[PDB]
Amino acid sequence: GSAPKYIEHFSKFSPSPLSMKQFLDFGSSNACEKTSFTFLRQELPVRLANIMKEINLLPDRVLSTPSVQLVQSWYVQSLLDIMEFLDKDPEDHRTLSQFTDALVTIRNRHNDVVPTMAQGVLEYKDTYGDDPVSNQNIQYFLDRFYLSRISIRMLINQHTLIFDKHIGSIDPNCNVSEVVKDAYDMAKLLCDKYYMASPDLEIQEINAANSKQPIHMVYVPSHLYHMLFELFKNAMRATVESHESSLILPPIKVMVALGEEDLSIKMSDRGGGVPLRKIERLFSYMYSTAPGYGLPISRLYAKYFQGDLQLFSMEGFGTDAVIYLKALSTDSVERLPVYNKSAWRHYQTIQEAGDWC
Amino acid sequence: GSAPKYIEHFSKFSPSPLSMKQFLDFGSSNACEKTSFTFLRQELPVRLANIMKEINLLPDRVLSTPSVQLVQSWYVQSLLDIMEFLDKDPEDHRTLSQFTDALVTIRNRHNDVVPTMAQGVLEYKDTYGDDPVSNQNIQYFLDRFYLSRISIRMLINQHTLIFDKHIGSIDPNCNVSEVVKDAYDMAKLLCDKYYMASPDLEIQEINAANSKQPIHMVYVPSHLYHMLFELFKNAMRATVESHESSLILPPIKVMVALGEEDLSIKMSDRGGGVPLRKIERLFSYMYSTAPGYGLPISRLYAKYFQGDLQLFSMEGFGTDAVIYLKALSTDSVERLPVYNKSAWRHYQTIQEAGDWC
């Protein structure tokens, strides 16, 4: 009967965003998991508490819903699961071992948070409606909640993966074009299965400072894969469906550019395009629910390390999707939400008559 | 001694946004200026009052500054200038005539609002600093103020121009590619004068529903010209300066696309590009002041009729600038700010510790 107490305690702390450089450190090749354990033992509780504190501070219907209250109950379990180690000591080649077992266990317990939280969104639509203010509140909360989750899973993955070339999920020499090819291959496979047709791929890179040298960077390849796969699938479907009465289906072109501080990936298709007004809704969780969240969540993966994901099409022609990542491991630092008085007022919207007419 | 009274009176009203279709009407070929006079006699005072009411409701230093207080005094004059007709009657081929003379007079009086207001921005920077909250407040206010002005000048221009093929400043058959060529020509001229070199132009259009038919639309050609000229100048300078040690300067490519609801113009250059972080500042009045406002104001002209202006580059390669306009005269309606309790709280920012860490 002490969950509320903990949440109240650790929510007083602020999570500590780590640089991509720091991850490499705590990962190294030998760096003892002892440091990780002592660190994670405090940080994880801090991150859980912050997001839980924010959850408990939103409309009672959103709280009383089976989904939100359900995932909330999952986080309560996990919080406790970790407290168990606060008064434990390393040295015991066991204390550490049972920690990972605990982390791995916490991971599977949360494996369905996205689909579940997504279920609450549909319930909300049917229960209260799809007004702009509701959209805003849900959008604001879900971006933070999901980003919070990405980071917690990040920490957990680095630890479990390392402690038993690549530093866990991080590749200090990730070749961007290669991940682009992989994501394309999978998308093509699925495209051929469903449409029995698929556009080809053209890749071009621009290494501003070193003309012919292949482009490499320090990054999490699975994160980049997820973003690119989502984009290829949309670009393929649009290209295919928009040319079902034509025969020349055009190719998807990708450009990978490496500048002084940005590493940019642009994906250009000729899938017909989308009016400007519908672009805005493509990133909304609410407006993209029925009767998926690939795009809004993909954008969160870009933002996680100070990047971004943007779209701009030309209705009647095609669409350009661009992923902006930080070129230097130095500028690559976790983007983490924090529960403040600042965050509180984003939920005080009492909309009813705008400033424009 | 009754200026405050009027402002208080007309600020209780909401301006009335007009469609591009309505402009054509009140413009027609014979439509009597009588209707215009009776309409403008009320609307103009309503628009002036709204913006003036908003001005009087911001920090005393911004008010006490010579610039803001100075333009504010210009608006006070103009408000009075028009009141003079509230108790006047048409029929008198004179009452109307002296109205235009009054409008034309009001126009010249405001001819330097931009440079002047821009002067207050620099003064503010030196007087109070360039903090994010100040930026926000200035950005919010200036976008509305300048948009308000664009509309007032619009009404005034339609009236003065018509009453003495084209319906004033509006061209019901504006050929987009043609305006693109004009804007390019002027920019090239200036480019050659200063740099003694300039990239060429390539134009391509995509008429989705009618393959080879030239693209036309109902619009204000001078508005479109201004936006395109600003973009060409930036694209030329970047292309030139980024290739001063090379010889192959590449061309600026423009695509004009006409879809079911959007008419889009994309301008692509290979001027080297800009990091993502600096893009955000290109639209800020504050962050773009020294020791111009082409971009932020150009964006306002796009937004005026429900359009937009966006930028996205690839650092180390180039930049795409896109102007989104409504394809149909039906969806082309004035975008006007209004003084509400809604607008009031955008100036209540008391920033000090964000929701992200």
Side-chain angles (χ1 to χ4, degrees), chain A residues 1-350 353-357, chain B residues 1-350 353-357:
Chain A
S2 49
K5 185 184 177 187
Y6 299 135
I7 299 176
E8 185 54 53
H9 176 55
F10 298 93
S11 88
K12 295 174 182 172
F13 294 55
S14 286
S16 305
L18 309 179
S19 79
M20 192 95 273
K21 214 295 282 296
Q22 289 172 298
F23 273 99
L24 292 173
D25 283 46
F26 292 63
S28 183
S29 182
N30 296 173
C32 64
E33 40 184 298
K34 305 182 296 179
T35 312
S36 178
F37 173 64
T38 66
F39 173 64
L40 291 182
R41 187 167 64 179
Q42 168 80 348
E43 199 48 37
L44 291 175
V46 180
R47 296 192 182 193
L48 294 164
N50 266 276
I51 195 59
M52 289 161 81
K53 183 73 184 294
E54 195 161 318
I55 285 165
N56 301 331
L57 295 184
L58 42 63
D60 297 303
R61 27 72 174 295
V62 191
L63 293 162
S64 296
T65 181
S67 57
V68 175
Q69 220 197 76
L70 172 55
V71 299
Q72 177 64 297
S73 63
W74 291 17
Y75 277 67
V76 171
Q77 258 302 76
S78 285
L79 212 196
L80 308 178
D81 279 45
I82 302 183
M83 305 275 68
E84 188 107 5
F85 299 75
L86 286 169
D87 283 50
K88 260 58 181 175
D89 287 306
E91 304 170 295
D92 186 52
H93 305 295
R94 300 168 181 174
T95 303
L96 298 181
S97 191
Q98 34 192 289
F99 183 57
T100 68
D101 294 3
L103 290 187
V104 175
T105 301
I106 285 176
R107 182 172 56 183
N108 320 314
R109 175 186 304 173
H110 290 71
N111 251 303
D112 303 300
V113 176
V114 187
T116 299
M117 287 295 307
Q119 173 164 286
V121 178
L122 177 49
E123 275 164 20
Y124 183 106
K125 284 172 63 68
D126 299 325
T127 302
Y128 297 102
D130 41 51
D131 57 292
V133 171
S134 284
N135 175 62
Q136 190 179 303
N137 292 162
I138 294 174
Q139 193 64 27
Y140 180 76
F141 166 74
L142 277 183
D143 277 341
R144 294 163 64 79
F145 176 76
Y146 285 143
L147 237 194
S148 162
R149 173 172 187 258
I150 289 164
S151 60
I152 293 173
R153 261 169 63 72
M154 236 308 249
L155 300 179
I156 291 179
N157 288 315
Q158 281 301 289
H159 193 59
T160 62
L161 279 175
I162 299 175
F163 305 117
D164 300 358
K165 303 291 289 301
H166 279 65
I167 307 304
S169 74
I170 297 169
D171 182 343
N173 269 76
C174 177
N175 172 291
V176 182
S177 288
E178 190 51 33
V179 181
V180 172
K181 297 175 192 175
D182 297 333
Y184 168 76
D185 292 329
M186 251 312 293
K188 170 166 164 51
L189 201 81
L190 294 174
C191 194
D192 285 330
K193 277 289 176 180
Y194 186 101
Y195 297 98
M196 299 167 267
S198 71
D200 295 317
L201 163 73
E202 281 177 39
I203 297 181
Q204 180 192 315
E205 45 187 73
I206 310 288
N207 192 325
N210 295 73
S211 194
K212 292 311 181 69
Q213 302 310 70
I215 294 170
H216 295 89
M217 74 175 295
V218 175
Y219 206 69
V220 183
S222 70
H223 276 32
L224 177 60
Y225 179 92
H226 183 133
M227 294 188 279
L228 285 169
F229 179 64
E230 172 63 22
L231 294 180
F232 273 125
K233 286 190 298 176
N234 296 323
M236 295 191 164
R237 163 179 155 75
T239 302
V240 164
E241 300 187 350
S242 75
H243 289 71
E244 303 197 310
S245 281
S246 160
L247 294 171
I248 300 169
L249 68 48
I252 293 177
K253 316 191 178 202
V254 172
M255 182 182 125
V256 177
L258 177 64
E260 288 301 295
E261 64 176 280
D262 294 352
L263 198 175
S264 314
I265 309 166
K266 158 140 64 170
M267 183 175 89
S268 306
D269 68 59
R270 291 181 183 59
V274 169
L276 186 55
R277 44 173 278 279
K278 298 189 181 174
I279 286 299
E280 332 280 55
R281 313 174 66 66
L282 286 180
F283 286 96
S284 164
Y285 299 99
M286 195 164 88
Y287 301 159
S288 68
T289 297
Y293 299 152
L295 273 178
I297 287 183
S298 282
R299 188 208 252 161
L300 296 181
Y301 275 94
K303 285 178 183 304
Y304 180 43
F305 279 114
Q306 310 300 312
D308 201 1
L309 194 158
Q310 309 176 350
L311 301 181
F312 33 85
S313 51
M314 305 282 279
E315 194 197 22
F317 176 72
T319 300
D320 283 10
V322 183
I323 296 175
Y324 292 104
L325 304 174
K326 291 298 193 182
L328 315 180
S329 52
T330 304
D331 309 309
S332 302
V333 187
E334 290 190 290
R335 163 76 170 173
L336 308 170
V338 176
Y339 173 60
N340 294 317
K341 149 62 188 302
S342 173
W344 185 78
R345 45 199 179 189
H346 279 67
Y347 299 114
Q348 300 316 112
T349 324
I350 308 150
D355 42 344
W356 307 84
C357 62
Chain B
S2 49
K5 185 184 177 187
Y6 299 135
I7 299 176
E8 185 54 53
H9 176 55
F10 298 93
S11 88
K12 295 174 182 172
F13 294 55
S14 286
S16 305
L18 309 179
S19 79
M20 192 95 273
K21 214 295 282 296
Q22 289 172 298
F23 273 99
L24 292 173
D25 283 46
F26 292 63
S28 183
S29 182
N30 296 173
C32 64
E33 40 184 298
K34 305 182 296 179
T35 312
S36 178
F37 173 64
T38 66
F39 173 64
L40 291 182
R41 187 167 64 179
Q42 168 80 348
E43 199 48 37
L44 291 175
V46 180
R47 296 192 182 193
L48 294 164
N50 266 276
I51 195 59
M52 289 161 81
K53 183 73 184 294
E54 195 161 318
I55 285 165
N56 301 331
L57 295 184
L58 42 63
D60 297 303
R61 27 72 174 295
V62 191
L63 293 162
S64 296
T65 181
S67 57
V68 175
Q69 220 197 76
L70 172 55
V71 299
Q72 177 64 297
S73 63
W74 291 17
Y75 277 67
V76 171
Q77 258 302 76
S78 285
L79 212 196
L80 308 178
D81 279 45
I82 302 183
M83 305 275 68
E84 188 107 5
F85 299 75
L86 286 169
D87 283 50
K88 260 58 181 175
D89 287 306
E91 304 170 295
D92 186 52
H93 305 295
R94 300 168 181 174
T95 303
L96 298 181
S97 191
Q98 34 192 289
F99 183 57
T100 68
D101 294 3
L103 290 187
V104 175
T105 301
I106 285 176
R107 182 172 56 183
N108 320 314
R109 175 186 304 173
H110 290 71
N111 251 303
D112 303 300
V113 176
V114 187
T116 299
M117 287 295 307
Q119 173 164 286
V121 178
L122 177 49
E123 275 164 20
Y124 183 106
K125 284 172 63 68
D126 299 325
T127 302
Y128 297 102
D130 41 51
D131 57 292
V133 171
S134 284
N135 175 62
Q136 190 179 303
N137 292 162
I138 294 174
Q139 193 64 27
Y140 180 76
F141 166 74
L142 277 183
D143 277 341
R144 294 163 64 79
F145 176 76
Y146 285 143
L147 237 194
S148 162
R149 173 172 187 258
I150 289 164
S151 60
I152 293 173
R153 261 169 63 72
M154 236 308 249
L155 300 179
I156 291 179
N157 288 315
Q158 281 301 289
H159 193 59
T160 62
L161 279 175
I162 299 175
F163 305 117
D164 300 358
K165 303 291 289 301
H166 279 65
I167 307 304
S169 74
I170 297 169
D171 182 343
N173 269 76
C174 177
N175 172 291
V176 182
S177 288
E178 190 51 33
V179 181
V180 172
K181 297 175 192 175
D182 297 333
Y184 168 76
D185 292 329
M186 251 312 293
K188 170 166 164 51
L189 201 81
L190 294 174
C191 194
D192 285 330
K193 277 289 176 180
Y194 186 101
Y195 297 98
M196 299 167 267
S198 71
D200 295 317
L201 163 73
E202 281 177 39
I203 297 181
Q204 180 192 315
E205 45 187 73
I206 310 288
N207 192 325
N210 295 73
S211 194
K212 292 311 181 69
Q213 302 310 70
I215 294 170
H216 295 89
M217 74 175 295
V218 175
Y219 206 69
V220 183
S222 70
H223 276 32
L224 177 60
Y225 179 92
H226 183 133
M227 294 188 279
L228 285 169
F229 179 64
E230 172 63 22
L231 294 180
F232 273 125
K233 286 190 298 176
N234 296 323
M236 295 191 164
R237 163 179 155 75
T239 302
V240 164
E241 300 187 350
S242 75
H243 289 71
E244 303 197 310
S245 281
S246 160
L247 294 171
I248 300 169
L249 68 48
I252 293 177
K253 316 191 178 202
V254 172
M255 182 182 125
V256 177
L258 177 64
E260 288 301 295
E261 64 176 280
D262 294 352
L263 198 175
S264 314
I265 309 166
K266 158 140 64 170
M267 183 175 89
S268 306
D269 68 59
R270 291 181 183 59
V274 169
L276 186 55
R277 44 173 278 279
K278 298 189 181 174
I279 286 299
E280 332 280 55
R281 313 174 66 66
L282 286 180
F283 286 96
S284 164
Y285 299 99
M286 195 164 88
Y287 301 159
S288 68
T289 297
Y293 299 152
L295 273 178
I297 287 183
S298 282
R299 188 208 252 161
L300 296 181
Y301 275 94
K303 285 178 183 304
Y304 180 43
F305 279 114
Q306 310 300 312
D308 201 1
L309 194 158
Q310 309 176 350
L311 301 181
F312 33 85
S313 51
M314 305 282 279
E315 194 197 22
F317 176 72
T319 300
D320 283 10
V322 183
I323 296 175
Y324 292 104
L325 304 174
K326 291 298 193 182
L328 315 180
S329 52
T330 304
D331 309 309
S332 302
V333 187
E334 290 190 290
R335 163 76 170 173
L336 308 170
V338 176
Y339 173 60
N340 294 317
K341 149 62 188 302
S342 173
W344 185 78
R345 45 199 179 189
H346 279 67
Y347 299 114
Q348 300 316 112
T349 324
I350 308 150
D355 42 344
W356 307 84
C357 62

